[PDB]
């Protein structure tokens, strides 16, 4: 129960640089960044390459084909993977409507 809330709170400290933050940084400027992973394509690319270290897969993805195969590949590669609910919260922490996935590599 509380595990999902704690995981989301922890991920809230790895928020990807949103548009507003990017604009503020660019204006101020006018050691690579570390943040969670959201894009399914590059998340899968990191998978099968072992760059991924933690994976959460949305449990309510409408194209269930998009997520049926991910657990199998994660088990094959040994990358820690889990199922997660709350695609709305996933989108909120990713700064988008939804992402269907949440992976992390450079965990502090």
């Amino acid at each position: 129960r509380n595990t999902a809330a704690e995981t989301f709170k922890l991920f809230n400290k790895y928020r990807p640089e949103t548009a507003a933050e990017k604009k503020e940084r660019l204006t101020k400027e006018a050691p690579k960044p570390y943040a969670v992973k959201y894009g399914l394509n590059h998340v899968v690319a990191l998978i099968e390459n072992k760059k991924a270290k933690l994976v959460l897969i949305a449990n309510d993805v409408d194209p269930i084909e998009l997520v049926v195969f991910l657990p199998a590949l994660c088990k094959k590669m040994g990358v820690p993977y889990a199922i997660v609910k709350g695609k709305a919260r996933l989108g909120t922490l990713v700064n988008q409507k939804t992402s269907a996935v949440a992976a992390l590599t450079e965990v502090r």
């Binding site: 690319a45 194209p63 269930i64 998009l66």
Partner: protein, 177 residues
């Protein structure tokens, strides 16, 4: 590209998971109208290779056709008759039933400034492509017409009517040969 895994999974159509998904989706569609809008295609792997993109202007329609002329072509014509302002870029089967077949059709909005300014996709804005489905210029229409290279399609390489006129219309020059 993660879409390769999805395509490989879809190749084995007789899998239990795919059967479950198909039997759920057919029932879900049966509760909706014959033709309806879809927020996004259920087969992104098919859509991407057929040319659909997530940018604005593209539209996805789901159409049911009674089973028992190409069914894909009929569905394309039916959806075009409704979405007059849209151009039917492509279509593909997504589900079937004992008496009904389900097709997802991707169309482009030529009136959208995004498509108009997209050099890679602005070609469809030409009026020559108006009502593309009505002339069978799509993939299904070309397949039905049999316009393909090879001896098998020699007699219909350039349209049966055109070839008949060409081979049965007498031609005479100023100086007789």
């Amino acid at each position: 590209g993660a879409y390769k895994y999805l395509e490989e999974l879809q190749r084995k159509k007789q899998s239990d998971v795919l059967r479950f998904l198909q039997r759920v989706r057919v029932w879900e569609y049966r509760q909706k109208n014959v033709i309806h809008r879809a927020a996004r295609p259920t087969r992104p792997d098919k859509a991407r290779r057929l040319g659909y993109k997530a940018k604005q202007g593209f539209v996805i329609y789901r159409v049911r056709v009674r089973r028992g002329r190409s069914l894909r072509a009929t569905a394309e014509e039916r959806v075009g008759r409704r979405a007059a302002n849209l151009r039917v870029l492509n279509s593909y089967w997504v589900n079937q039933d004992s008496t009904y077949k389900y097709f997802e059709v991707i169309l482009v909005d030529p009136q959208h400034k995004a498509i108009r300014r997209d050099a890679r996709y602005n070609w469809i804005c030409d009026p020559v492509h108006k009502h593309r489905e009505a002339r069978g210029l799509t993939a299904t229409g070309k397949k039905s017409r049999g316009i393909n290279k090879g001896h098998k399609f020699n007699n219909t390489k350039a349209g049966r009517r055109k070839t008949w006129k060409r081979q049965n219309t007498l031609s005479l020059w100023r100086y007789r040969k």
